[PDB]
Amino acid sequence: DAITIHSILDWIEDNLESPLSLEKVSERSGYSKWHLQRMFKKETGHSLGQYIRSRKMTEIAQKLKESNEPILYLAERYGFESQQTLTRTFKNYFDVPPHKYRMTNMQGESRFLHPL
DNA sequence: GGGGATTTAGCAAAACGTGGCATC
DNA sequence: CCGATGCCACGTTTTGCTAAATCC
């Protein structure tokens, strides 16, 4: 798995940025969703679902601070059906909505997950 | 007193995460 | 028999909808 799981990882980072990268779409590449999940968990100790999301939340967080792309545009661009949906997911992952997170200095790298 | 941008609400519906099992 | 796999059941979580607050 190390070899194939280590690959699905690149394909993911080579995606989130727009895809809905759901377990199914992620399934396509490789085996059955349940299996890919089995391998990847045992391989990374990280559930596929929460890792992808952790990666999208960490990436949306860096753009809110390194750029001015409107959060609706960020919502649509990372696969969210709306601002409200992203607003609640962001809030749930950071405990601070997107705009408020955008306008605060002290708020740091806290909770960021990186590429693997 | 209005208006757009943000944030929250609340419940059902769909997706996850996983262990036990049938299969390849 | 073994082990990599697909699968289903099912407790948890997240999203889909729909409105509505709050902010500025």
Curated annotation (Swiss-Prot):
Entries under InterPro entries matching the protein: Homeodomain-like_sf (IPR009057), HTH_AraC (IPR018060), HTH_AraC-typ_CS (IPR018062), MarA-like (IPR050959)
Ranges of residues in domain HTH araC/xylS-type: 6-104
UniProt record, GO biological process: negative regulation of DNA-templated transcription; positive regulation of DNA-templated transcription; regulation of DNA-templated transcription; response to antibiotic
Origin superkingdom: Bacteria
Pfam families named in the record: HTH_18
Any GO CC annotation of this UniProt entry: cytosol
DNA-binding region(s), chain positions: 23-44, 71-94
Recorded GO MF terms: bacterial-type RNA polymerase holo enzyme binding; DNA binding; DNA-binding transcription factor activity; sequence-specific DNA binding
Keywords, comma-separated and alphabetical: Activator, Antibiotic resistance, DNA-binding, Repeat, Transcription, Transcription regulation
Induction: By various antibiotics or by sodium salicylate.
Parts forming coiled coils: none
Subunit structure: Monomer.
Role description: May be a transcriptional activator of genes involved in the multiple antibiotic resistance (Mar) phenotype. It can also activate genes such as sodA, zwf and micF.
Protein's name in the database: Multiple antibiotic resistance protein MarA
UniProt organism field: Escherichia coli (strain K12)
